Amino acid sequence: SRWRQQWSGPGTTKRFPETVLARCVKYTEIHPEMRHVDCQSVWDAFKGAFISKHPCDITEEDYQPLMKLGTQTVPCNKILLWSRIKDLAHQFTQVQRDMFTLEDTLLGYLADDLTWCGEFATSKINYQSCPDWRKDCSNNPVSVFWKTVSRRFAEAACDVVHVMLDGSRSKIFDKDSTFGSVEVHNLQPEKVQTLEAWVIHGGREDSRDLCQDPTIKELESIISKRNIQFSCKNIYRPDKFLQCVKNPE
Ligand SMILES: NC(=O)c1ccc[n+]([C@@H]2S[C@H](COP(=O)(O)OP(=O)(O)OC[C@H]3O[C@@H](n4cnc5c(N)ncnc54)[C@H](O)[C@@H]3O)[C@@H](O)[C@H]2O)c1
């Protein structure tokens, strides 16, 4: 458009509509329980959330239509959260197939690793640039999507929730993360009894107990205040943790 400003973030991912549709079909092919879903309606509601809208004023209410159509019941006691250890978290749920990350749900599978935005009063997707959360604005279509769906996934969890955390990082638990700033605060104390952390070892540092780390202690404190118990395990050898998950016989 004639009035469209430059943003600092990458533009909408190449072939976005077509990638979303193909993913919706693919997901429902592999997951027979979701075949009631009309993928054209799914796309049309996703689109309705952000096109013709200034992409610094996107709200949770904008995505409500998408949320309704994406309604999915996962077994609430088989939930895996994670923070900066994507590869191992999803390798885990590929093998232990009764456990679920957000990206194993429909809505999460669709949006995984994609960028998108539009512009006020146009029907056009902006392929040139999109708002960066830091340099531009926080209420952008991508950020608002993930905080909305991450809240609802956490709200649905029950009994024992597991979180996988990256032990090679400087801040093993990080307040400024989806886990740290959305999910820990929206687990329901009525439904959830325990949050169990799995700290995955790697990188340079020599082998020590990482459940004694200052960020883990901070985490323990944050969740205790919410009246939910905390547990923590070291996973020293990720290599052999998958081997005995995938072949316990
Ligand atoms: N808001 C988002 O941009 C976003 C994007 C993708 C996924 N998610 C949420 S975060 C949650 C787990 O991640 P986290 O707890 O570490 O939260 P985060 O905000 O630190 O990470 C989210 C995203 O940041 C992105 N990112 C991380 N590091 C970099 C980086 N160094 N350069 C560019 N992008 C980066 C990457 O796409 C990652 O998936 C995941 O399951 C989803 O529910 C949020």
From Swiss-Prot:
Reported pH dependence: Optimum pH for NAADP(+) production is 5.0 from either substrate, activity is much higher at pH 5.0 than 7.4.
Impact after mutating C76K: Loss of cADPR hydrolase activity
Membrane topology classification: Single-pass type II membrane protein
UniProt keyword annotation of Transferase present: yes
Extracellular side: 2-249
Catalytic activity, reaction form: 2'-phospho-cyclic ADP-ribose + nicotinate = nicotinate-adenine dinucleotide phosphate; NAD(+) = cyclic ADP-beta-D-ribose + nicotinamide + H(+); NAD(+) + H2O = ADP-D-ribose + nicotinamide + H(+); cyclic ADP-beta-D-ribose + H2O = ADP-D-ribose
Phenotypic consequence of C158E: Loss of cADPR hydrolase activity
Notes on how activity is controlled: ATP inhibits the cADPR hydrolyzing activity.
Protein name: ADP-ribosyl cyclase/cyclic ADP-ribose hydrolase 1
